[PDB]
Every structure is written in C-alpha cells, then in structure tokens.
Ligand binder design. Structure first.
Ligand SMILES: NC(=O)c1ccc[n+]([C@@H]2O[C@H](COP(=O)([O-])OP(=O)(O)OC[C@H]3O[C@@H](n4cnc5c(N)ncnc54)[C@H](OP(=O)(O)O)[C@@H]3O)[C@@H](O)[C@H]2O)c1
Ligand SMILES: NC(=O)c1ccc[n+]([C@@H]2O[C@H](COP(=O)([O-])OP(=O)(O)OC[C@H]3O[C@@H](n4cnc5c(N)ncnc54)[C@H](OP(=O)(O)O)[C@@H]3O)[C@@H](O)[C@H]2O)c1
Lengths: 325, 326
C-alpha cells in the first residue's frame, strides 16, 4: 500500500487523490502547501493527514511517493528535490519546461533508485493499446489531432490579469497545457517524429492562446491544434491506405470507428474509464509494486520524445519563457 | 433571352454543368469542342442539335455567347484567353489558372474585349456564405479550421503506376489546386485576403501534393487549411469567435451551420442547401450577364486574385512545382 504525499492544492490534486484512493493502491498521508491554512482547507475532507509548509520538512517525512501538481515552472526543482530525498515522483504534465530538465530528472532518479513518471493520463488509456493493435497491420497516411477548449481563466485574462497558465513565468500556453495531449497520442501510436513545426496566436509575453502545428513522419504528417481561448469539437482522424479511423478525442477516448473507402464501418472496442486518471493511477502503482523495467524505459523514452517536440514547437512559434529571455 | 452555350471538356463535370445550366432555364447548349470529333460525338449524343468541333479556332468563330471550360488545369489559361479574344464570355473551371499573373492577363483580355470571365468557384456563390458572413459581421473572429479531403477516384490508376492528370506536374495538379482551393475560397469569401500563408505537403516524386496542411495568417487570428486526395476527412469546419464556435458541416455545398456559445446555447443558421453543387453559381453567372452589377463582378475578380495569390504562395512554401516552372 503506497504512502502518498502531495504538492499543489488545486482541484486536480483532489481528482488524483480520489482516483488513487479508489484504485485501492495508495493512501494519502501528507500535504505540502505554501500556507498551512491552504493545506488544512484542502486536507479537511480527508482523515489524519500531516501538514507541511516547508518542503525540506515535507521530504524528510515518511511516504513512498509524491504527486506534484504545482505550476509548470516549479515541477523540475520540486521533483529533483523529491528524488534526492528518495521519493518516487508522479509529475503532472507538462513535466518540464525543457528536454534537458527531463534527462537530468532521470539521472537523479537512477542515482536514488526511484521511479519518475509523467502523469500523461491519455498515454496510459487502454484505448491506445486497442488502437495501435488495430493499425499494426495497416499503413498510416496521416493524422489530425486536437485539444482546444475555452479556459476558465479567460475572464481573469480578459480583465487584465495574467493567470499562471498564460504567464511566461510559469511556463504556460496552449501548447504546454493542452497541446501536450495530442503530442503524447502521436508518440504513443507513431513513436518519435522526424521534425515538427508550430505557429501560434500570441499574447505580448509570447505565450500562445492557440496554435497549429505539424509533426513530420517518414511517409506522413500529423496536424496538431491547441487552444485555450477557443473551443474546438473536431474529432481526431487517422488516415490509412484503406480508410479513416475516427476517434472522438485523443484524451479520455470514448469511441474509435474505422470507415473504409466503400463506407463500411468497424467499431473498435473502446471502454472509456470512469475517470480521466484511473488508468495512469493503476499503471504507476503496478510499476512500483511489480517493476517491468523495459516498460518503464519506454515511458521515460516517450516522455523524452514529447518534450523534444514541445521545445522545437515553442522555438518555431517564438514562445519564450521568462528564464529564456 | 437564352445564353447560347459552348463547352470545352468532355468529362463528367461538363455533363453536370450542362444539366444545371439547362435546369436554370437560362442557358442552351449549342456547341461542343473536343480534341477528337468522335469524343465530341459520344459526349453530345444525349443532347439535341449540337454542333461539333475539333479545332478551337473554328469553335470560337461560331455563334454562341459564352463558353464553359473544363479542360485540364494547365490548359485553362490559353483556352480562356483565346475565347475572350474571340469575344466570348468565359466560365473557367477551378482552379482557373496556375499563377496569379495569368488571372490578371485574362482579366485584361476580358475587359478589352468587353466580356465577362468567371472562375467557377461553386462554393463561393452559395447563399450559405451570405448568411454566415452576415452572422459573423458583429462577432470578433479568433480563428478558423477548414478542410476538403476526399479519396480520389484516380487513386487506383496512380497506385497502378500511371499518372492521372490530377496528380501530374504537367497539368497543374495536386490536392491544394484541386480541393484546397475550396477552403481558400471560403476563407477569402468570409475574411478577405490573408497577410501571409504557409503549406507543407506529402508529395509524389514530381513534387505534386497528395495531401497537406497549411495556415492563412490574418492580423488577429489564423486559419488552418487541410487538403487531400489520397485520404478522406469528415472533419467539420469551425470558425471561432470571442463568444463561441460556429460549426459548418463543410465549406462546400454547405448543409448546416450552427453557432454554440460558451454557455452551450445554440443558434441554427438558416441554410437551404441547393439540389446540386453548381445550382447557385450557374444562376449567379447568368444573372450577372443579363442584369450586371459590375461592382459585384469586380469583387468576384479581386477575390479570385486573392485566392490564386495564396495558392501560389502555398505551392512555393511546400515546394510544389509544375513542369513549366522547373
Ligand atoms: N492531468 C490533468 O487532467 C490535469 C488538469 C489540470 C492541470 N494539470 C496540471 O497540474 C498542474 C497544476 O494545475 P493548476 O491549474 O492547479 O495550476 P495552479 O492553479 O496555477 O497552481 C497549482 C497549485 O500550485 C500552487 N501555486 C500556485 N501559484 C504558485 C506560485 N506562484 N508559486 C508556487 N506555487 C504556486 C498552489 O498551491 P498552494 O497554494 O497550496 O501553494 C496551487 O494550488 C499544472 O502543471 C497543470 O498542467 C493536469
Ligand atoms: N466545380 C467542381 O465541382 C468540379 C469537379 C471536377 C473537376 N473540376 C474541374 O474540371 C476540370 C476537369 O476535370 P477532369 O477530372 O474532368 O479533368 P480531366 O479528366 O483530366 O480532363 C477533362 C477533359 O479535358 C480533356 N483532356 C484530357 N486530357 C487532356 C490533355 N492531355 N490535353 C488536352 N485536353 C485533355 C478531355 O476532353 P477531350 O478528350 O474531349 O479533349 C477530358 O475529358 C478540372 O479543372 C477540374 O478542376 C471542378
């Protein structure tokens, strides 16, 4: 039974803990916050939880694993300290702001004999295994993936504030916050791309409100759309020589249907999970309990591929964070 | 009084045009040109009392008011120029030309011979676009996503090692030129000319694009464009505004247009899809000739120029080069 520490008192932390408890494989025991009162307010719905407003003291406590859902810009430093203190780390997406940070995390992890995982919830969905198997004997000719929805932080932005998710100080933007999902889907299904491009509508601080990119593969390309000031409801498509696979989304996928060039249809057996994080939560605890180091190596590798793509795409669009300026 | 119609091109598309022309009550087919008189004969046989021709010079000397031209893309320019110099009005199938200077050249020739020239951009003329543009008139647009990608009937020939005209660098083929022009025309119709454009394609050895993705850049937003001929997409087309998303089932022969706001309220736009894809353009062209609104005609010419400029810019970024350009 895994002892769970948590950083970040956002709603997402509640969602993770709720999935972790439900799996029957974790037990929350500790919470860190910048303020004790915020930790208390967060923890009040739970029972017997140690509270911390000092990261140093937090990491010296007895737990096995820490879920980190702080702002993007803080992920690296907090995760590195967690690993140095011999804790396993589940790190919310996007795990890092630069590919080198990911490689440094891995080294730090190996040194301290701990697992580091990016909480790429869509990547672990059983749907993707079903979809990849289906395409195994097919020849892919292209794809079109998106994730664009109108942020709850839009009113604050429009009123002249700069919410963390739209700030260059906190490594935000549509590509970082949402575009990472279709990138993870592409890597899951197609592996590492050859190259990538991205162009975005940007705020004055260079952060992207929305954008369009392409991932380049040997005999095809994948259009990527990300957006936070717009709502898209476009399905996601994968083209093959014999037809088109239509996925309703590339996250928390609920249907996958193949149509051939004569209009004959095949419904892939998709069984959406009750919650968005159910499958990653099971996968992570399964890995720590019964290590498949080969599977672990691919998770690390695919995360590396995603963050290389993100970084290339930010560079082409001119999306620059404060520490890069 | 009926417009006497001559036709170049004996493909299925010419039969479809003629059918719409006759159904409108505004045209009467009188002449058909073909490279071979026998090809003209087979094509003409379903009609009545049609003159057949196998020489363009002789064709253009006969009595008809206007010519519909549906030859391969690379032949559009020279044939249309000859028609206009012969004093015939021209409906030229899309894509009208291979480079914007050709379009300007046709317009100059048309004006000096006091004739109309129309690009047969069937979607641009759909009443749906008037309804959509009126609805967007007091919204603030934040971007759009348009596509036209359908698996070509010429794919089996292609895959068998042949090279159909639509996939040939000698006939100005490719997904962008053949299908991509529809979303471009839709974008120009609603938003006007973009400030810049890019396109990246999957290409045959002759540089012709099987499919591709591009972006039209406007001052405060961008429009994703997808075109394809070796793939089939059924993605809807979206226009984003500050207050919601307008969803069109397509940007050609549009059937439905629904606006959904950020609170989930829906507004259905009144779209009345024509019985046929060409109904609306055929009525518009006849109406322009018989009861001209010349200012509107000029807008049609300008917008076509905008479309072909974007097309040409996009071919250049993707490296799509025709035989004449190599
Ligand atoms: N997998 C998913 O479906 C999912 C959904 C949402 C987001 N995520 C990710 O989870 C992470 C957090 O999301 P979020 O929207 O909750 O971010 P956030 O609200 O900006 O920050 C999250 C937590 O970090 C702390 N924090 C806020 N501002 C800070 C600052 N200036 N300096 C240090 N700490 C600060 C706060 O906790 P304290 O007040 O207790 O210090 C806050 O509760 C992001 O990386 C995001 O990408 C994943
Ligand atoms: N608006 C629409 O919805 C619609 C749909 C389809 C096509 N179009 C357009 O219509 C035009 C033709 O399409 P298509 O598929 O029918 O093209 P196509 O088959 O390649 O050629 C059409 C006609 O042009 C002639 N032709 C063929 N090869 C030729 C050559 N090497 N040299 C000179 N003439 C040749 C043939 O007529 P002859 O044998 O009698 O000479 C043929 O019937 C294209 O510009 C296309 O973009 C638009």
């Amino acid at each position: 039974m895994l002892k769970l520490g948590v950083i970040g008192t956002g709603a997402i932390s509640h969602h993770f803990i709720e999935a972790a408890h439900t799996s029957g494989e974790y037990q929350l025991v500790a919470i860190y916050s910048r303020k004790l009162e915020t930790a208390a307010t967060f923890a009040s719905r739970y029972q017997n939880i140690q509270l911390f407003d000092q990261l140093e003291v937090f990491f010296k406590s007895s737990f096995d694993l820490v879920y980190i859902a702080s702002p993007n810009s803080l992920h690296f430093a907090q995760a590195k300290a967690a690993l140095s203190a011999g804790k396993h780390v589940i790190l919310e997406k996007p795990a890092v702001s630069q590919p080198q940070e990911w490689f440094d995390l891995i080294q730090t992890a190996e040194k301290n004999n701990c697992f580091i995982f990016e909480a790429a919830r869509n990547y672990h969905e059983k749907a993707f295994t079903t979809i990849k198997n289906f395409l195994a004997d097919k020849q892919v000719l292209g794809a079109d993936f998106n994730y664009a929805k109108y942020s709850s932080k839009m009113p604050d932005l429009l009123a002249g504030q700069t919410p963390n998710v739209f700030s260059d100080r906190f490594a935000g933007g549509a590509l970082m916050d949402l575009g990472i999902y279709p990138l993870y889907a592409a890597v899951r299904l197609f592996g590492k791309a050859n190259d990538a491009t991205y162009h975005a509508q940007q705020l004055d601080n260079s952060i992207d409100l929305n954008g369009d990119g392409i991932l380049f593969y040997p005999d095809y390309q994948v259009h990527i759309k990300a957006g936070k000031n717009i709502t898209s409801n476009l399905p996601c498509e994968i083209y093959t020589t014999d037809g088109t696979l239509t996925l309703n989304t590339i996250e928390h996928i609920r249907s996958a249907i193949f149509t051939d060039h004569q209009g004959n249809q095949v419904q892939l057996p998709i069984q959406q999970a009750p919650h968005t994080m159910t499958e990653e939560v099971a996968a992570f605890a399964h890995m720590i309990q019964q290590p498949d180091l080969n599977l672990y190596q691919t998770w690390l590798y695919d995360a590396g591929s995603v963050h290389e793509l993100l970084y290339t795409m930010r560079q082409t669009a001119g999306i620059r964070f404060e520490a890069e300026k």
